Amino acid sequence: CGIGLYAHLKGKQTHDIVKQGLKMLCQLDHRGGQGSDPDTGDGAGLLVQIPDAFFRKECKNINLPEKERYGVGMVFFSQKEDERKKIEKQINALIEQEGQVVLGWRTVPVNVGKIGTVAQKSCPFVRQVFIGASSDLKDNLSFERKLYVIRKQAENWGVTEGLDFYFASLSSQTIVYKGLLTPEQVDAFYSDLQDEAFVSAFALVHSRFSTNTFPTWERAHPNRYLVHNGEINTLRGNINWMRAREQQFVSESFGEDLNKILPILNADGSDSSILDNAFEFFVMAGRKPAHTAMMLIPEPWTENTHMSKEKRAFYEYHSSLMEPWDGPTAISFTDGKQIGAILDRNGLRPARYYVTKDDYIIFSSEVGVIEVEQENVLYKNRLEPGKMLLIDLEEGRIISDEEVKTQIATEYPYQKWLEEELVQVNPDPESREEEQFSDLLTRQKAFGYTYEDIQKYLIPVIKEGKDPLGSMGNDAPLAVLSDRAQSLFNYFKQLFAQVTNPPIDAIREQLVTSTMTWLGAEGDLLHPSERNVRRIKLYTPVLSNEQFYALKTIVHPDLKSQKIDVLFSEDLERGLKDMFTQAEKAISQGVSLLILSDKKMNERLTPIPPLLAVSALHQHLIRKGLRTKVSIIVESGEAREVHHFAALIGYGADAINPYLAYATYKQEIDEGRLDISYEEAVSKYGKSITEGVVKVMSKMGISTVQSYRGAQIFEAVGISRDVIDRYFSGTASQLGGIDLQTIAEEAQRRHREAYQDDYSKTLEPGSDFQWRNGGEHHAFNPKTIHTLQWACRRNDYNLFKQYTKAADEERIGFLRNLFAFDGNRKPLKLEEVESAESIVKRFKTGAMSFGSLSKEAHEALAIAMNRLGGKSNSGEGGEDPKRFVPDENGDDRRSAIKQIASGRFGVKSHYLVNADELQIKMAQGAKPGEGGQLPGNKVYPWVADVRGSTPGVGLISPPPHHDIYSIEDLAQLIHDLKNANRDARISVKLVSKAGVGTIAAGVAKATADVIVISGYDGGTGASPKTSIKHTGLPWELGLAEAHQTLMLNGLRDRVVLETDGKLMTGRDVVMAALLGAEEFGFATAPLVVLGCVMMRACHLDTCPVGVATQNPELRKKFMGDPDHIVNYMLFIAEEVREYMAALGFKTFDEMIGRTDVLHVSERAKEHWKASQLDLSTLLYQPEGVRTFQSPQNHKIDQSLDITTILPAVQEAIESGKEADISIEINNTNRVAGTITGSEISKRYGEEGLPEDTIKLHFTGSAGQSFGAFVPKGMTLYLDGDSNDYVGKGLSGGKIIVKSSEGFNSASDDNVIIGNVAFYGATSGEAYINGRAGERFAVRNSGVNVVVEGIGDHGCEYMTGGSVVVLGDVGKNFAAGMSGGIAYVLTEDVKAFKRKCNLEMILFESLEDEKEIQQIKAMLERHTAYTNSQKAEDLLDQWEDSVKKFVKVIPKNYKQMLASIEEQKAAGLSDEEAIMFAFEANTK
């Protein structure tokens, strides 16, 4: 999988370029995954110029005119011929009507026998049509426009008629050959390519991954204009905005053709296809390709101080008319005479290119793509973020990004337009009116406020400036299942970025985010001038009362406002329709602001659910082409939570005004509490809410509220598909659910009780994150907790039976509780079913970090699992090596499963090898799309030593896996982990959500042994309450979808399915097995057995039972025993055995997948809203295998390490003797050393081997993950270059990379290393002879490196080690730096400081003799091993080099080190000195 392009700068056309392009595709094929069979083409394509010579030679009948006056089509047709000639006749008729001449038609030869069975079956008929331009069209742009119009008309006619034909390409300068073909199969299929007449100045190439095993020929790309690598996470919003703007579009170039080309985008197309359609439409509209690319994927201008004034003005101006297309994207577009390449704003994809002395450019994701002559290579560079690589064939030169951007920005006076046309809403200062109602309690009851809600969400927000944290994720039932009336917000769950796109850290990458919002009417997008920026702009969507009043009282005729009371009595549909009519009337009158208000509501008039109202109005205006002319303000009392604000924004709201929350704050201030003033309280609330919304966007990876607003990142749970289509189009609802009448009934009920409420003047206590008598049901209620504890302590069975009965029946807590067994079968005896000893082997204790838990609880769980034969999971906090050896008494504290998270804290070669399963935590239930933060006060020495960090220094776990930016990266990481431990099972832990089945299929293609599905009810030690409650979906839907999709794609037998999330009973285990889960996870219940009483205070480090705290005093109160866990697991297994006997099932494999045994219970039908759910989606059994059989054959064999290195290194490792060997390496050799490192670690362990014992030289270009998990004793040399992930998880050893001896250019100017390097590294050293890419030393924890320049986000989350940079540094340096030291050599200290992040670092100078000597020795080693001219010059001028060097060190790190050194000088031992310093600095 990937993209590439081989081109000649001057425009010389040859066939060797095409041959080389197919060679690059063949080389890149290794990145893609493996499907059902290898022979089937996953998807590939090749774009080239028009082959005039070949066409002239091969036609012999059609009179082809000169180059630019005729065009060539390319059509995929169905095998049927009648419709084929029908479409041909229609196309000819359209061409004649447009006036262009039909030169003729041709049929492309196809070698079907060279293709796989599925692609053979789906192979279409390939026919081209030739168009000749009329004499009237003087310029080629008009001819291209005519062809575009013809193609759009043909596509519209085809979709209207229902015919299935595709226009792969129709242009006068470009031709595309693509399909479900492998790189080797492309040339064989297209016999034309073999002919030498094929000549083109450039050749672009793409190969796909095809997450699902059912791709289509049409969906393959290169598309008509560009190739896109990655994913788009704002697709819904982009589509909606584009279809709203298309109606208002007016262009002179197209004239009346706009009606013909109205659809613009294809609804059923993919993200890449839609992006290509938008790009081509904007190009024909009169915009240059570079301008269109910049407008579609703008650079981050908000919060970015590294951008010039002209560029900032340009991007700010274009943000008023085009929202960003966010996501990881690498785009390469071409228009025949111009070629361009760009990356997304955050630069999350790799792109390296070579420029040769013979005017040839080779650009691709990988670097070792073709064989090149070093003496011929001129430049080895990479595509930097915010930089466009542009080539003009006619001009025969590469146009500088600076020149392109400067020209485009200066072409108009954007800054002057912004300064002049901006409108100010400066409010009056004496109009202050602190609003109070005197019916505050009644309104609070009506909108669902509670004393818990206030005291635990509103006051903490003011106090802390952030959304309050929590623990023990939601155990309460869903809104659709709860008897109590619930708000419509609770029916929608936040989505998140799991795979195919990573999340982002908004705090650390604030320079990439933007909360800017535009209010008003958009101008003429196609022909913009001045009026496009004659609107209001806000930095925060949350509006204070004064701002709301000012907006209402603007009065400006150009900026008019209208207020609509969203209230209803009986007919919600009627209310919505009156709102629609009022909006249309206001728009006709010229209003540009619509203010939906819940105020002026009484017992007779209840407010419409603001989410429903906003969504319905947004959809209606989008359909009618009027949304872009207005903006939506909401004034509702049901808006007090980050989830509420995020839902409103994502479903269409432009601004919100929480007047009732402000009134509550005012009342609290007036009654004595909350001494802070009303104004500061309001401002703090607004800022905190905006930050929470930004975090919610970061969960999915969206960096801009503008895109998030259109995008719908929420999935409904319990809403009818009819209602969804009417008002929430594009949203997912697997089971449908309640209807508009039920929603209105719930709202009316809440309003009526609140308004009557004639007994009490107090708010009822909440039950969302706590249990209250008479409140909402909680699965872990006191009765269940005490019953389970008593049963486990007795080793008694009837108590456990009572606990199981209470947990399962008497309330509806989960979806699975709605199912009942058939009860009409042949019951067997308990002796005819498999034993509990075999059953328990499928159970696990779940991941729980050592820091989050206590040592006693962790070791107890591990001991219980090992004794029972199951598997225990070590969290992201690492593991103690002493636990790998069983105790004398026989108890084993080792964790069978080792977790890999974004932090990579304890990740090491020893840590990985000493395991049976390696899990990859892509997301967890409570905080799927978020990371973590461990304060220094919580970083105790016994935790810091385990995690390889400094005590008292904060630790940050980034949300995303910086390796995993896509499914291909996930596959690469799986391959690296398998290399590290070939005798281990690779697991991937995901969280249930829509599309999780397709993601699981993609994972199986990526060759993951185990797939784990986690429900949103899963626990955690610390997470935001909004993330706990409103993020994720139940594991039932995800498990069912994954099972069905895997069985359909024929991959179920290759993977093992596991589930977790509120598995408390054998009935739950049985239901999971029937849904298709082979393994089950249990985390919370073991804690309750150990003593947890669901205090939900894990994040406070104050557990009274010494379970989730590191305090010795509380740990002394720990009374848990592994025997209780053993008894709990055995009781669960006995329950499963009894259920299997009742159902007549003899084995777990036999029962798995048998959903026919289940039927909807009468309780669900009796329920007034759970009876409207369609559970047939879960009750479905496709034909296929329902159990893991195939062992998921990896590619460990045929690897370089196995073939060459190991056979010549095993004896040396065994004998402990030196051994030096040399190999030639290409990009297909990815890891190249991890297996040897794992063998060394297994033989010896942490001590490894003596330094410079094993020496491995490599010549050429290396693949991804070079030198990963290399322990001490190994020294890798690389003469050439390397790709991303160099030194990943380094556990010692040496890595040296030197430029090829034949490359005479400046290494410090030339790029030699990929983006991510030494991510999660713990120990070792490295020496890089050249520039690196983005995110260099992301999570280094002791590795010392010397590098001649790096990219952006350097030393992001370092906690230890040192970094020496002999060159420039990218922006956002040291973003998250909590430990370690960075030394940078530069001439402009001011520029370096501006580039760096100033939050948590200090700037110093090299004054310490020891530090100076260490740096000098490092440079001496670097120059000895590299022959670096820069290092030699610096050593010669050492006196000036020290003066001009710059030092970066975290404040807390420096203070802790100074305190420890002072205590050591005073004469205190290491442990006691560390403890005293930690206490002093964290008192």
Next chain:
Amino acid sequence: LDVLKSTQTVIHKALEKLGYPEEVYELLKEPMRLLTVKIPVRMDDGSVKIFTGYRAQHNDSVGPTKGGIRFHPNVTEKEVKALSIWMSLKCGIIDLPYGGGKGGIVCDPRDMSFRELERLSRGYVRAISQIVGPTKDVPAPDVFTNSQIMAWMMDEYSRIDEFNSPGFITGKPLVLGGSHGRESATAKGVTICIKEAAKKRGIDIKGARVVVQGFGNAGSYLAKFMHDAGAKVVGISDAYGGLYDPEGLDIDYLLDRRDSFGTVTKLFNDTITNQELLELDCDILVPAAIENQITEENAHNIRAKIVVEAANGPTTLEGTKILSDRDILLVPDVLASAGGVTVSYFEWVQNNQGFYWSEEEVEEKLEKMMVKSFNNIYEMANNRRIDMRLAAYMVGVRKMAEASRFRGWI
């Protein structure tokens, strides 16, 4: 409740200091023409609502009254009279050929609509058309009023008088006879006062440290003017907090990122509260924000040599007393915020002439007028050991009293 009494007290004190008899105070304590009217307005729902309007004219001896109209529900006769007297004081301070006027309507523009607002403005103009005009009374905008409302009033008056009367009302758009500099007038006047005070105190504007509490239009324009003059702005504030940088704050970038409401603070960055912003080390302090910010506790903690009250009444009597004891030069609001009135006067002059000036002409004329007023007040307060506030009040009442005596009303 006691606004009218306080205004009467300051008028009495100023007249006593100037030496005028008690009949002058008896004449100037209350307006000689107060009109209360009832305006029927047809609403969108089709109903009819009766609004209450007030118009007060303090004096006309100097010339036609000049006043403002505010659309607030808390307006009252006492407030209207007091603000008319204050407008007379401002006109006298600036030496304009105007009297004091004030209009008000009991309404809630937040609940009112566009067409309802137009109808209400037209009805008010009709009700008061009998005593207003370009030669009698000139309204302007105030709370919940703007150029659109002024244009509606102007259209109403022209439609009544059968010919266009741009000079009847100020604050109009440019196309209807408005004047340039209507937005930066207050900030420019504050800048002029700051420069004059610095010259008097010997402080060089080049490198002078300025702190501005409030970053609305006035605050932004004032910060830009100081930056252009060369002074360094070491602190600004908005609704969410403030920033501090002794070496400069990059006003250009701050204005570039400034939104419509004036917010410039970052999201995940801690801010400086106003209480400790007022206590920062600076030479010039400018509160252009909410009132009652300087009191006894923070008066001693204030480190500013010059304090300019850009907003309305940001300082109390105790704070003024403490600042006078500490020898801190205080520039009253009644003088600092006269730029808007001066620009409205320039608009009236342009309407009378038929010739409309430019930004540079408006700038220079405002500079001369404000400099003359500031110098007169400073010389008065130096000759008499009193405060600038009292000197400004005396200067305001002197012209009106002399005109009344000359015309023979007393």
